[PDB]
Amino acid sequence: DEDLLKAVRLIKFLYQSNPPPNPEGTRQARRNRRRRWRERQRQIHSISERILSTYLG
């Protein structure tokens, strides 16, 4: 189904966007982006989870 294919293609794009950091070293500032990137991926995870779940049950 057209919609589902489009939805998955989009979720993939959301993971492609906001990818791993740099990497760059700086005291406590290196671990600062870990917090940032974890938060962002934890979010994408649940969004994708929800988006897909609507195309099933």
């Epitope: 489009k6 939805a7 966007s17 979010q43 988006i51």
Partner: antibody, heavy 117, light 111 residues
């Protein structure tokens, strides 16, 4: 600092295609959701569709599909009314989702489309 | 194909008085819900996003909640300003049922 302004709202004859424009400006964020919402004279809000910015991910509503075309660009988002009818008279809005949690944080002031003979 | 069932159509209430607007979801919608106030000839303003949290600026008297398919906006100690139409927005644009609007509830302040 973010902002949205719509233009292109004008009186048109029926079937005579119009194109609406939304001037996206000040968004630190790369790609996001940009939705089109209409509101006819003294009526409720109706979501028309949306687009994910960084891609070409067009999403329309049950009624809108076909007669509508959302087009993302550098600067900026458009809405084409392929075959307008009198029932399309409304003020169209563009609204951004700066969080990607299906909610319109920033709105445009609107632009009035008028479909009449 | 997702539908929002906003109740009531209109509502009158004095200052101090409390208001309750209800939205009835036609499908799932997790925190896939937001509440908006719209004063005449003005673009809507977000009050409550992700069903229960208030946008910045929005005063404490604005309360959001929901239980699976029932969502409630609760303006507690209503003030003169709050006089406006109110909409709820449910879903995500990314289908399968897209995102849909409440359909309004006009609030008349009583003096």
């Amino acid at each position: 600092q973010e902002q949205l302004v719509e233009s292109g709202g004008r009186l048109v004859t029926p079937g005579t295609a119009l194109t609406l424009t939304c001037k996206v400006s000040g968004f630190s964020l790369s790609g996001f959701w940009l939705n089109w919402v209409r509101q006819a004279p003294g009526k409720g809000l109706e979501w028309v569709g949306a687009i994910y910015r960084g891609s070409g991910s067009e999403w329309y509503a049950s009624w809108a599909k076909g007669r509508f075309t959302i087009s993302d660009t550098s600067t900026t988002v458009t809405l084409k009314l392929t075959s307008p009818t009198t029932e399309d008279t409304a003020t169209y809005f563009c609204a951004a989702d700066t969080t990607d949690n299906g909610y319109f944080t920033i709105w445009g002031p609107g632009t009035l489309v008028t479909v009449s003979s | 194909e997702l539908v929002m069932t906003q109740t009531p159509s209109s509502v009158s209430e004095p200052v101090g008085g409390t208001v309750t607007i209800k939205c009835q979801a036609s499908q799932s919608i997790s925190s896939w819900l937001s509440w908006y106030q719209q004063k005449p000839g003005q673009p809507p303003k977000l009050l409550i996003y992700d069903a229960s949290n208030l946008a910045s600026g929005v005063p404490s008297r604005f309360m959001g909640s929901g239980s699976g398919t029932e969502y409630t906006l609760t303006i507690s100690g209503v003030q003169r300003e709050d006089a406006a139409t109110y909409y709820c927005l449910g879903g995500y644009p990314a289908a399968s049922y897209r995102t849909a609007f409440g359909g309004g509830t006009e609030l008349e302040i009583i003096r």
